């Protein structure tokens, strides 16, 4: 695996069983850490760590195609095992963190960020009022196409976010579909799978952990 | 007209008066049917029929630029006469159908589909609850730019859908503008035309059938 | 600075201190006027004036990257000093005007227009009911990413429009954030800046005019 470093005390640990074809990984700064686990396919992506003390953690069996990712100083991106991601954008700044859980499915066109990238202040006392806020995406979350996840949003486990939805606020209820304008729970007590089965979840051995 | 077939009992009937420059039509499977009527211009498009028993019907005088279309087994796309379509995406799966009526105008950036492409099941009994559902777009419908039409949606005749609108549900009232979040009827008893006339529909001979 | 003219009585006044690399400016028609002030950077853009009596006014210190702009007869685009604009689209037709104030920041993916580009008529009397309407963006407005501003919209001074918001209607209150579906005021009595300061607006000498 080839990449560009400018700086020192960086640790780039990419498993020999993983593939990174057509991916550019650039590390500019010091004390940054990259971990890519076994049997990953991180393809046609552009990942830029610019700053110090940055952490990128990608667990085993993760498949990414066409991610554009920018991390700044003291920021963390963690993506857990068996997650798949199509084309999309992740930006982290303001020393923040974004976490994506196990076996998520992120469809084409996601935009996920913990930051507005410019400050907004109160006229009453001058104080900044739009500080960055971490994003937490739970286990087994499916983002439909063209979903935008903004700062501070926490998504519960086993959730479907409907295509073309923008989330500004966190939710607490697991096992639901969230969609609409504004985003709201539109269906409760569900589970999603990858492979289209015509009739029943019991036909899909991969889903036993949810019921 | 050149195209790729892999399979048999396919029928590809493209009128000798129609143009298909820079269009890729791929048929992979058996017993599929393609009809393109007279005086069509189907340009810079990518149309893939992968499966068996697929029907693609495009009537006379249809102009398409930059359509990306995927059809799977037993699916049907029907587009009626004088309809125009700019760049966009149509996906049909789950043995479903999408119909577009006569003299529609689909502006840049449409996404139309009858499927979520992955299953959602009820935790209560395991049953699938997001089966594909047909899409019916009536006669003389105008989709403004960047409109998304999701599964099951039926749009009445002589409707304008405002740009950047997502439709999840069907409507019944013809001769209206639907726009907003959620999509709603914002104007009733109207008719749209193609050519900008400054003052009156009576100046446009092409609109006599609507009043 | 090179450009294409087809027609006469055009005036193309581009300051010798401004840069227009990779920008195509095309003027097709008569009596059109282009002014680009000092120390501008108008880059990788495509600006087409097709018609007569068109005015394009760009003041000093304006930086534009990847604007696609179309103006038709008797239309006006005015962009005031120190405004910055990333990639985006502006369309003006129906002899209308779009104005953008001083020191605005237009993030990637804006779409701004004064026109529906096709007519909608009343069935009751045949009259056109969707005439073009001017767009006025005030001083010190920040459009977040992928914002759409439709015809007739006036935005007050010192406003933030949240990313992925569509505005259909004007607002009157300055010093606010507008976001959501439908767009609404979500925060009042604020001011935004460009450079991320961790704690206070008083640290940014460029903002003294707002409190």
Swiss-Prot record, chains A, B, C:
Gene3D superfamilies reported for this sequence: Hexapeptide repeat proteins (2.160.10.10)
Matching InterPro entries: Hexapep (IPR001451), Hexapeptide_acetyltransf (IPR051159), Trimer_LpxA-like_sf (IPR011004)
Keywords, ordered alphabetically: Transferase
Residues the record lists as binding acetyl-CoA: 116-118, 145, 151, 163, 168-169, 187
Catalyzed reactions: [(2->6)-alpha-D-glucosyl-(1->4)-N-acetyl-alpha-D-neuraminosyl](n) + n acetyl-CoA = [(2->6)-alpha-D-glucosyl-(1->4)-N,7-O-diacetyl-alpha-D-neuraminosyl](n) + n CoA; [(2->6)-alpha-D-glucosyl-(1->4)-N-acetyl-alpha-D-neuraminosyl](n) + n acetyl-CoA = [(2->6)-alpha-D-glucosyl-(1->4)-N,O(9)-diacetyl-alpha-D-neuraminosyl](n) + n CoA
Record EC number: 2.3.1.-
Pfam family membership, one: Hexapep
Record GO terms (molecular function): polysialic-acid O-acetyltransferase activity
Membership in a protein family: Belongs to the transferase hexapeptide repeat family.
Misc remark: Polymeric sialic acid-containing capsule provides a means for the bacteria to evade the immune response during infection by mimicking host sialic acid-containing cell surface structures. O-acetylation of the sialic acid residues of capsular polysaccharides alters their immunogenicity and susceptibility to glycosidases.
Entry function: Catalyzes the O-acetylation of capsular polymeric sialic acid consisting of polymers of (2->6)-alpha-D-glucosyl-(1->4)-N-acetyl-alpha-D-neuraminosyl residues. Shows high substrate specificity toward polymers of sialic acid that contains a large number of residues.
Subunit and interaction comment: Homotrimer.
Annotated protein name in UniProt: Polysialic acid O-acetyltransferase
Name of the gene this protein is made from: oatWY
């Amino acid at each position: 695996h080839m990449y560009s470093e400018q700086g020192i005390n960086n640790t780039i640990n990419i498993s020999t069983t993983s593939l990174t074809n057509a991916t550019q990984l650039t590390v500019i700064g010091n004390n940054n850490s990259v971990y890519i686990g076994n049997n990953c396919k991180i393809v046609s992506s552009n990942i830029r760590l610019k700053g110090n003390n940055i952490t990128l953690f990608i667990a085993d069996d993760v498949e990414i195609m066409g991610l554009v990712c920018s991390l700044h100083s003291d920021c963390s991106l963690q993506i857990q095992a068996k997650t798949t991601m199509g084309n999309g954008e992740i930006t982290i700044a303001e020393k923040g963190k974004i976490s994506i859980g196990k076996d998520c499915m992120l469809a084409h066109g996601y935009e996920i960020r913990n930051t507005d990238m410019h400050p907004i202040y109160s006229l009453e006392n001058g104080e900044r009022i739009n500080h960055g806020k971490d994003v937490i995406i739970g286990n087994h979350v499916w983002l439909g196409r063209n979903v935008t996840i903004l700062k501070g949003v926490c998504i519960p486990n086993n959730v479907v976010v409907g295509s073309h939805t923008v989330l500004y606020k966190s939710f607490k209820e697991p096992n639901c579909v969230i969609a609409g304008s504004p985003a709201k729970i539109v269906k409760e007590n569900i589970v999603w799978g990858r492979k289209m089965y015509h009739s029943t979840m019991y036909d899909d051995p991969t889903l036993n952990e949810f019921y």
